[PDB]
Short mmCIF file of C-alpha atoms (C1' of nucleotides) in Angstrom, two decimals:
data_model
loop_
_atom_site.label_atom_id
_atom_site.label_comp_id
_atom_site.label_asym_id
_atom_site.label_seq_id
_atom_site.Cartn_x
_atom_site.Cartn_y
_atom_site.Cartn_z
CA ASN A 1 122.03 80.56 49.73
CA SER A 2 123.40 77.04 49.27
CA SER A 3 126.46 75.27 50.36
CA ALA A 4 127.98 75.60 46.74
CA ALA A 5 127.26 79.35 46.57
CA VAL A 6 128.33 79.84 50.36
CA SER A 7 131.51 78.06 49.57
CA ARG A 8 132.46 80.33 46.73
CA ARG A 9 131.54 83.43 49.08
CA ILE A 10 133.82 81.58 51.65
CA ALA A 11 136.65 80.95 49.20
CA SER A 12 136.78 84.64 48.34
CA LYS A 13 135.91 86.36 51.76
CA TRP A 14 137.09 84.28 54.78
CA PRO A 15 138.94 86.39 57.27
CA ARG A 16 142.38 85.64 57.06
CA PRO A 17 144.12 84.55 60.14
CA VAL A 18 145.69 87.04 62.48
CA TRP A 19 149.14 86.19 63.36
CA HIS A 20 149.55 84.78 66.86
CA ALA A 21 152.68 84.05 68.63
CA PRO A 22 153.38 80.60 69.52
CA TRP A 23 152.90 79.44 73.03
CA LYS A 24 155.37 77.12 74.90
CA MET A 25 154.89 75.09 77.86
CA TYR A 26 157.25 76.49 80.48
CA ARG A 27 156.13 75.11 83.88
CA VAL A 28 154.58 71.83 85.32
CA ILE A 29 153.41 71.70 88.86
CA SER A 30 153.04 68.24 90.49
CA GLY A 31 151.28 67.91 93.88
CA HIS A 32 147.68 67.11 93.18
CA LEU A 33 146.94 63.38 93.85
CA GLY A 34 144.26 62.83 91.18
CA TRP A 35 143.37 64.41 88.00
CA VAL A 36 143.29 68.15 88.01
CA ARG A 37 139.76 68.89 86.76
CA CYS A 38 139.30 72.78 87.23
CA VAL A 39 141.07 75.85 87.30
CA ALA A 40 140.11 79.36 88.17
CA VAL A 41 142.27 82.41 88.12
CA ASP A 42 141.69 85.19 90.68
CA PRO A 43 140.50 88.72 89.44
CA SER A 44 144.03 90.03 90.82
CA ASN A 45 145.87 87.48 88.56
CA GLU A 46 148.22 86.55 91.36
CA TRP A 47 146.94 83.26 92.37
CA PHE A 48 144.87 80.30 90.62
CA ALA A 49 142.96 77.65 92.33
CA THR A 50 142.81 74.03 90.93
CA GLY A 51 140.24 71.43 91.98
CA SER A 52 140.97 67.85 91.72
CA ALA A 53 139.89 64.16 91.86
CA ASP A 54 141.93 63.98 94.99
CA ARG A 55 139.06 66.12 96.32
CA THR A 56 141.04 69.11 97.18
CA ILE A 57 141.29 72.70 95.94
CA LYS A 58 144.93 74.02 95.81
CA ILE A 59 145.66 77.76 95.79
CA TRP A 60 148.81 78.42 93.66
CA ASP A 61 150.90 81.36 93.22
CA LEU A 62 150.42 82.58 89.43
CA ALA A 63 154.07 83.82 89.01
CA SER A 64 155.95 81.05 90.98
CA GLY A 65 153.53 78.08 90.57
CA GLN A 66 153.87 77.69 94.40
CA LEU A 67 151.40 75.79 96.41
CA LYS A 68 149.73 78.58 98.69
CA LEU A 69 147.12 76.58 100.39
CA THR A 70 145.10 73.38 100.08
CA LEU A 71 141.59 73.51 100.83
CA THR A 72 139.81 69.99 101.60
CA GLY A 73 135.98 70.10 101.81
CA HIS A 74 134.62 68.04 99.02
CA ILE A 75 133.86 64.32 99.47
CA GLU A 76 134.43 63.66 95.78
CA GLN A 77 136.19 65.26 93.01
CA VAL A 78 136.05 69.01 92.61
CA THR A 79 134.71 69.50 88.97
CA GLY A 80 134.13 73.21 88.81
CA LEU A 81 135.75 76.33 90.15
CA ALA A 82 134.62 79.92 90.03
CA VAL A 83 136.32 82.85 91.75
CA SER A 84 134.17 85.77 92.10
CA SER A 85 135.22 89.13 90.59
CA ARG A 86 133.02 90.91 92.85
CA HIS A 87 133.18 89.07 96.20
CA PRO A 88 135.90 87.55 97.97
CA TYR A 89 134.41 84.37 97.22
CA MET A 90 135.51 81.09 95.44
CA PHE A 91 132.77 78.59 94.38
CA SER A 92 133.46 74.68 93.90
CA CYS A 93 131.03 72.03 92.85
CA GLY A 94 131.96 68.47 92.99
CA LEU A 95 130.95 64.87 91.98
CA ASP A 96 129.49 64.92 95.64
CA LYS A 97 126.48 66.69 94.60
CA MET A 98 127.76 69.70 96.49
CA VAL A 99 128.29 73.31 95.65
CA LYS A 100 130.25 75.31 98.08
CA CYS A 101 131.08 79.14 98.85
CA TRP A 102 134.51 79.45 100.24
CA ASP A 103 135.21 82.68 102.20
CA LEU A 104 138.68 83.54 100.98
CA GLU A 105 139.10 85.81 103.86
CA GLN A 106 138.54 82.79 106.11
CA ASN A 107 139.53 80.05 103.93
CA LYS A 108 136.57 78.18 104.71
CA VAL A 109 133.26 77.21 103.31
CA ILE A 110 130.53 79.31 104.38
CA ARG A 111 127.68 78.66 102.23
CA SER A 112 126.44 75.40 100.66
CA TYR A 113 124.07 74.95 97.82
CA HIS A 114 121.96 71.87 98.22
CA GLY A 115 120.01 70.39 95.64
CA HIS A 116 121.62 68.58 92.91
CA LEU A 117 120.51 65.03 92.59
CA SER A 118 123.67 63.70 91.03
CA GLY A 119 127.45 64.92 90.66
CA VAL A 120 127.80 68.81 89.71
CA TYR A 121 129.74 69.31 86.51
CA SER A 122 129.65 72.91 85.74
CA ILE A 123 129.63 76.21 87.57
CA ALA A 124 129.30 79.97 86.57
CA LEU A 125 128.91 83.09 88.61
CA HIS A 126 126.57 85.73 87.03
CA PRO A 127 129.13 88.57 86.52
CA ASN A 128 126.58 91.30 87.59
CA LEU A 129 124.08 89.60 89.85
CA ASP A 130 124.75 87.68 93.12
CA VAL A 131 123.60 84.53 91.65
CA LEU A 132 125.47 81.13 90.37
CA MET A 133 124.41 78.53 88.08
CA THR A 134 125.49 75.04 88.34
CA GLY A 135 124.99 72.00 86.04
CA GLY A 136 125.04 68.25 86.76
CA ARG A 137 124.28 64.91 85.90
CA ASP A 138 120.53 65.64 86.61
CA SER A 139 120.44 67.42 83.26
CA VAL A 140 119.26 70.48 85.19
CA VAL A 141 120.83 73.94 85.46
CA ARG A 142 120.22 75.01 89.18
CA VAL A 143 120.26 78.82 89.72
CA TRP A 144 121.28 79.93 93.14
CA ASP A 145 120.93 83.01 95.26
CA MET A 146 124.55 83.50 96.29
CA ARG A 147 123.41 84.90 99.67
CA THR A 148 120.31 82.94 100.90
CA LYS A 149 121.62 79.75 99.23
CA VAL A 150 118.30 79.44 97.76
CA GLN A 151 117.59 77.74 94.54
CA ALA A 152 116.08 80.50 92.71
CA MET A 153 115.51 78.87 89.49
CA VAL A 154 115.64 75.34 87.70
CA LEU A 155 116.50 75.68 83.91
CA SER A 156 115.12 72.44 82.64
CA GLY A 157 115.16 70.92 79.36
CA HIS A 158 118.47 69.18 78.59
CA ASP A 159 118.52 65.41 78.86
CA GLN A 160 121.87 64.42 80.03
CA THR A 161 124.58 65.90 81.93
CA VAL A 162 124.93 69.76 81.81
CA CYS A 163 128.89 69.86 81.13
CA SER A 164 129.51 73.43 80.33
CA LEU A 165 127.95 76.60 81.64
CA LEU A 166 128.33 80.35 80.57
CA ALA A 167 126.96 83.45 82.38
CA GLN A 168 126.86 86.82 81.03
CA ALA A 169 124.98 90.05 81.93
CA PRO A 170 123.17 90.38 78.43
CA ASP A 171 120.57 87.99 77.35
CA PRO A 172 120.93 84.81 77.15
CA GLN A 173 122.57 85.08 80.75
CA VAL A 174 122.99 81.46 80.75
CA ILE A 175 124.32 79.21 78.11
CA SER A 176 124.58 75.54 78.90
CA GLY A 177 125.99 72.83 76.81
CA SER A 178 124.96 69.12 77.58
CA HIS A 179 125.72 65.65 77.05
CA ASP A 180 122.49 65.65 74.86
CA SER A 181 124.60 67.37 72.24
CA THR A 182 122.64 70.65 72.64
CA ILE A 183 123.25 74.06 73.71
CA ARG A 184 120.66 75.99 75.50
CA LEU A 185 120.45 79.70 75.76
CA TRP A 186 118.38 80.41 78.58
CA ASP A 187 116.14 83.45 79.40
CA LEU A 188 117.10 83.78 83.07
CA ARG A 189 113.84 86.00 83.92
CA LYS A 190 111.65 83.46 82.61
CA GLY A 191 113.43 80.30 83.42
CA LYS A 192 112.99 79.15 80.09
CA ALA A 193 115.44 78.33 77.12
CA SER A 194 115.50 80.83 74.61
CA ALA A 195 117.21 78.89 72.02
CA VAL A 196 118.04 75.24 71.75
CA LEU A 197 121.01 74.72 69.32
CA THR A 198 121.39 71.27 67.68
CA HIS A 199 124.07 71.55 65.52
CA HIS A 200 126.54 69.48 67.28
CA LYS A 201 126.64 65.69 67.05
CA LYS A 202 128.75 64.83 70.09
CA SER A 203 128.18 66.43 73.67
CA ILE A 204 129.28 69.82 74.25
CA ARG A 205 131.84 69.71 76.95
CA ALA A 206 133.32 73.06 76.59
CA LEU A 207 131.95 76.45 76.20
CA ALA A 208 133.92 79.89 75.92
CA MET A 209 132.81 83.43 75.49
CA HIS A 210 134.79 85.66 73.55
CA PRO A 211 135.98 88.22 75.99
CA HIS A 212 134.77 91.30 73.93
CA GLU A 213 132.79 90.00 71.31
CA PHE A 214 128.87 89.01 71.58
CA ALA A 215 129.80 85.40 70.47
CA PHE A 216 130.76 82.19 72.02
CA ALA A 217 132.45 79.06 70.82
CA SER A 218 131.26 75.41 71.75
CA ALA A 219 133.43 72.32 71.35
CA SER A 220 132.34 68.76 70.77
CA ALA A 221 134.26 65.47 69.99
CA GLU A 222 133.61 66.39 66.37
CA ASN A 223 133.64 70.08 66.12
CA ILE A 224 134.29 73.48 67.64
CA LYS A 225 131.62 75.74 66.56
CA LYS A 226 131.35 79.53 66.92
CA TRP A 227 127.88 81.19 67.39
CA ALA A 228 126.62 84.93 67.44
CA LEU A 229 124.69 86.25 70.57
CA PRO A 230 121.94 86.87 71.45
CA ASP A 231 120.29 84.22 69.17
CA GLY A 232 122.85 81.68 68.61
CA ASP A 233 123.38 82.18 65.14
CA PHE A 234 125.66 79.62 63.91
CA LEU A 235 128.76 81.55 62.50
CA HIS A 236 131.12 78.63 61.72
CA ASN A 237 133.17 75.62 62.49
CA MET A 238 136.87 75.94 63.25
CA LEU A 239 138.70 75.24 59.86
CA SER A 240 140.35 72.00 61.12
CA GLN A 241 139.16 69.24 63.44
CA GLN A 242 140.99 68.46 66.42
CA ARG A 243 140.18 64.71 66.43
CA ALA A 244 139.62 64.60 70.14
CA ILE A 245 137.00 64.85 72.68
CA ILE A 246 137.50 68.56 73.66
CA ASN A 247 137.26 68.84 77.48
CA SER A 248 138.25 72.57 77.83
CA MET A 249 138.20 75.65 75.67
CA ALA A 250 139.61 79.09 76.60
CA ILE A 251 139.53 82.32 74.69
CA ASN A 252 142.03 85.10 74.76
CA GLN A 253 141.44 88.94 74.23
CA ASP A 254 144.11 88.45 71.19
CA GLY A 255 141.51 85.96 69.96
CA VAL A 256 143.75 83.02 71.01
CA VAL A 257 141.25 79.91 71.19
CA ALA A 258 142.95 77.15 73.26
CA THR A 259 141.11 73.83 73.18
CA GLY A 260 142.26 71.02 75.30
CA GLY A 261 141.78 67.55 74.25
CA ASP A 262 140.86 64.46 76.24
CA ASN A 263 143.72 62.96 74.66
CA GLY A 264 146.02 65.68 75.86
CA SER A 265 146.22 67.72 72.71
CA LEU A 266 146.19 71.28 72.91
CA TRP A 267 145.30 73.34 69.81
CA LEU A 268 145.59 77.13 69.68
CA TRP A 269 143.18 78.64 67.03
CA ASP A 270 142.75 82.02 65.62
CA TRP A 271 139.30 83.30 66.76
CA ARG A 272 137.85 85.18 63.65
CA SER A 273 139.20 83.06 61.15
CA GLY A 274 138.76 79.72 62.71
CA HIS A 275 142.33 78.41 61.80
CA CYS A 276 144.55 76.49 64.08
CA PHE A 277 147.88 77.98 64.52
CA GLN A 278 149.33 75.56 66.80
CA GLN A 279 148.98 72.00 67.73
CA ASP A 280 150.56 70.48 70.75
CA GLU A 281 150.48 67.03 72.55
CA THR A 282 151.04 66.86 76.24
CA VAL A 283 153.88 65.33 77.73
CA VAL A 284 152.71 63.30 80.74
CA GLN A 285 154.69 63.58 84.03
CA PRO A 286 156.74 60.58 84.90
CA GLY A 287 154.86 57.61 86.17
CA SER A 288 151.75 58.38 84.06
CA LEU A 289 150.12 56.17 81.52
CA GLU A 290 149.65 58.20 78.38
CA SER A 291 146.32 56.84 78.63
CA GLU A 292 146.14 59.21 81.66
CA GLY A 293 146.59 62.46 79.62
CA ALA A 294 143.69 64.42 79.19
CA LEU A 295 143.39 68.25 79.41
CA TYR A 296 140.41 68.83 81.64
CA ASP A 297 140.40 72.47 82.18
CA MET A 298 142.42 75.44 81.09
CA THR A 299 142.04 79.20 81.62
CA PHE A 300 143.89 82.12 80.60
CA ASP A 301 145.44 84.32 83.24
CA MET A 302 143.69 87.78 83.58
CA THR A 303 146.26 89.43 81.13
CA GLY A 304 145.91 86.54 78.47
CA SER A 305 149.53 85.85 78.41
CA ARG A 306 149.44 82.70 80.46
CA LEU A 307 147.45 79.54 79.95
CA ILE A 308 146.93 77.38 82.88
CA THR A 309 145.97 73.80 82.07
CA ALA A 310 144.56 71.23 84.50
CA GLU A 311 145.65 67.71 83.26
CA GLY A 312 144.75 64.14 83.93
CA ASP A 313 148.48 63.38 84.68
CA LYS A 314 147.60 65.31 87.88
CA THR A 315 149.73 68.14 86.99
CA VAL A 316 149.23 71.89 86.46
CA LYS A 317 150.80 73.13 83.08
CA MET A 318 151.63 76.78 82.41
CA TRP A 319 152.10 78.11 78.83
CA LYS A 320 153.30 81.60 77.95
CA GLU A 321 153.48 83.13 74.55
CA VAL A 322 156.80 82.93 72.84
CA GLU A 323 156.03 86.60 72.23
CA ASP A 324 159.59 87.42 71.06
CA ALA A 325 158.26 85.56 68.04
CA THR A 326 157.45 87.71 64.76
CA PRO A 327 155.36 86.55 61.96
CA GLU A 328 158.41 85.68 60.21
CA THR A 329 160.46 83.49 62.73
CA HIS A 330 157.18 82.05 63.91
CA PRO A 331 153.88 81.83 61.91
CA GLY A 332 152.88 78.38 62.94
CA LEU A 333 150.37 76.16 61.00
CA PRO A 334 149.79 78.08 57.64
CA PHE A 335 146.32 79.06 56.51
CA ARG A 336 144.60 77.96 53.28
CA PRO A 337 141.15 79.44 52.99
CA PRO A 338 138.03 77.10 52.97
CA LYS A 339 138.53 76.65 49.27
CA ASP A 340 136.35 73.59 48.79
CA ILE A 341 132.81 73.05 47.71
CA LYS A 342 131.29 71.12 50.40
CA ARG A 343 127.72 70.00 51.88
CA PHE A 344 126.88 71.79 55.13
"C1'" G B 1 108.53 135.18 126.34
"C1'" A B 2 104.31 127.93 128.53
"C1'" C B 3 101.44 121.63 130.27
"C1'" G B 4 100.62 112.68 130.09
"C1'" A B 5 99.06 107.85 131.95
"C1'" G B 6 97.78 102.88 129.03
"C1'" C B 7 97.85 99.88 123.49
"C1'" U B 8 98.95 99.14 118.88
"C1'" G B 9 101.63 101.30 115.48
"C1'" A B 10 106.97 104.26 114.87
"C1'" A B 11 111.66 104.11 112.11
"C1'" C B 12 115.90 104.08 113.91
"C1'" G B 13 119.34 101.12 118.15
"C1'" C B 14 122.01 96.63 122.16
"C1'" G B 15 122.81 99.57 131.97
"C1'" A B 16 122.13 93.34 132.84
"C1'" A B 17 120.05 89.09 132.42
"C1'" U B 18 121.35 84.23 128.32
"C1'" A B 19 119.59 80.24 126.30
"C1'" U B 20 119.16 77.54 121.73
"C1'" C B 21 120.52 76.68 116.86
"C1'" U B 22 123.68 76.38 112.22
"C1'" C B 23 128.29 76.03 109.61
"C1'" U B 24 134.04 75.36 109.01
"C1'" U B 25 137.42 72.71 112.05
"C1'" U B 26 140.03 70.34 115.88
"C1'" C B 27 139.42 67.21 120.42
"C1'" G B 28 136.89 63.23 123.41
"C1'" C B 29 132.71 59.70 123.86
"C1'" C B 30 133.15 55.46 120.05
"C1'" U B 31 130.58 50.11 115.83
"C1'" U B 32 126.92 53.41 113.08
"C1'" U B 33 123.62 57.91 112.92
"C1'" U B 34 121.06 60.56 115.93
"C1'" A B 35 121.75 62.48 120.80
"C1'" C B 36 126.67 64.51 123.14
"C1'" U B 37 131.72 66.56 125.39
"C1'" A B 38 135.23 70.86 125.06
"C1'" A B 39 138.30 74.02 122.12
"C1'" A B 40 138.95 77.46 117.91
"C1'" G B 41 136.36 80.51 114.71
"C1'" A B 42 132.31 82.13 111.70
"C1'" G B 43 127.01 82.80 111.90
"C1'" A B 44 121.78 82.73 113.34
"C1'" U B 45 117.64 82.62 116.43
"C1'" C B 46 114.90 83.31 120.64
"C1'" C B 47 112.95 85.85 125.05
"C1'" G B 48 112.93 90.92 126.15
"C1'" C B 49 114.40 95.94 126.08
"C1'" G B 50 114.85 103.08 124.95
"C1'" A B 51 113.77 107.61 122.76
"C1'" G B 52 111.71 110.65 119.46
"C1'" U B 53 104.44 112.09 117.12
"C1'" U B 54 100.80 108.37 115.69
"C1'" U B 55 97.04 108.61 117.61
"C1'" U B 56 93.23 104.84 119.15
"C1'" G B 57 91.26 104.47 124.22
"C1'" C B 58 91.59 109.48 130.00
"C1'" U B 59 89.12 107.90 133.75
"C1'" C B 60 93.07 113.94 134.49
"C1'" A B 61 93.54 118.83 133.26
"C1'" C B 62 93.89 124.31 132.43
"C1'" G B 63 94.71 130.49 130.69
"C1'" C B 64 94.72 139.06 133.84
"C1'" A B 65 98.53 133.13 134.08
"C1'" G B 66 103.83 131.89 136.36
"C1'" U B 67 107.02 135.62 132.01
"C1'" C B 68 104.84 140.36 128.09
"C1'" G B 69 106.24 144.26 121.65
"C1'" C B 70 120.72 147.50 138.51
"C1'" A B 71 116.56 153.59 140.18
"C1'" U B 72 120.99 160.50 144.19
"C1'" C B 73 128.75 161.40 147.54
"C1'" U B 74 135.82 160.67 145.18
"C1'" U B 75 134.95 154.52 139.63
"C1'" U B 76 130.59 155.04 135.96
"C1'" U B 77 122.92 157.69 134.44
"C1'" U B 78 122.87 163.28 137.81
"C1'" G B 79 129.12 165.01 133.40
"C1'" U B 80 132.98 171.59 135.35
"C1'" G B 81 130.65 175.54 133.90
"C1'" G B 82 132.57 180.50 130.85
"C1'" G B 83 135.96 182.71 127.44
"C1'" G B 84 139.48 183.01 123.87
"C1'" C B 85 144.56 182.77 120.75
"C1'" U B 86 145.92 179.84 115.23
#
RNA sequence: GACGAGCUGAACGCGAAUAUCUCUUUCGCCUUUUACUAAAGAGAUCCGCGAGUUUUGCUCACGCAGUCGCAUCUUUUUGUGGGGCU
């Protein structure tokens, strides 16, 4: 219609925020010797893996936070981690240009996916095919046969580092976000972008799918946008700006969107209304700089009740819902609908 | 109530012969990398191999044919007969 017309529609009909209980940080785990950069939860929900700048992958007990195992095989930072839901496999990528399949029955690297020309930044397992997708500084999403280690496909078109990656079973089966400020939705059968989304002004460092809805969120240093699938229809911006580079985004089944800032902020938003009900800043562990405070990864556990964050003060932090909270004792940041008339 | 030697196909399967490679680690050579050592594992490959009908190539061969739609003395096929009562 217009920006004015749509702004009046928006003042009338914006979905109100669903009340979400606040989250509190209940656990710091020290022990990585570099920035914790990636997290991944195992589908059983009993351990998580964190990769680091100290080049290791640590396996942690999800309920005690206990170091179960350290895995060394990367030469540089571990930048991405993906635990398979269908295979007893963990996948890691790293700044060493290397993608590794870890056999979790051996605790050993059994396959290596060779071919990234620069450091690898993002990883994604196809949820239904035995295929993995990695993006890196060579601006390219490399699509790998899990079994034969073969590079089945190269998704070309981005211009800078592919920083975020999504994989789903419906079309578009790969979503990438890049430092070139675009999101490509890919047709995995054709090897071609099915859509290029140019609404972001900064680089898209975080993508997240909605667990249940056909929609994803992308996050920049400037906005978190929400997009409808298959075609990547812009739904909306979050109703506030985390004034931070967002490194990580996780979405819950309750629709809690967690976004984690390069400055160590953690904002919790209502998916579906776009409204942030919580805003936190990290505390950095003793010794750290407060410059060294970013929030590089976050995942929810499989139930959605825990959020594990991988931080630049080299900690894993764990957050649980203060779910003994009720919309009366704990509403959080309160909502004013987007009443403005603005230009879009 | 009944008949193969040799080749390529079979699609399924590893008597006693065993070499190479890859990966993840440790160990030893030790300036580095190859090229190596010897331990732990996890994976491949090579060179070969057995049976089923597929026949190609016999240079062998066939049909009143080997087989068809237990044979009289006490224990078995040489029965103990005949009558008649409720």
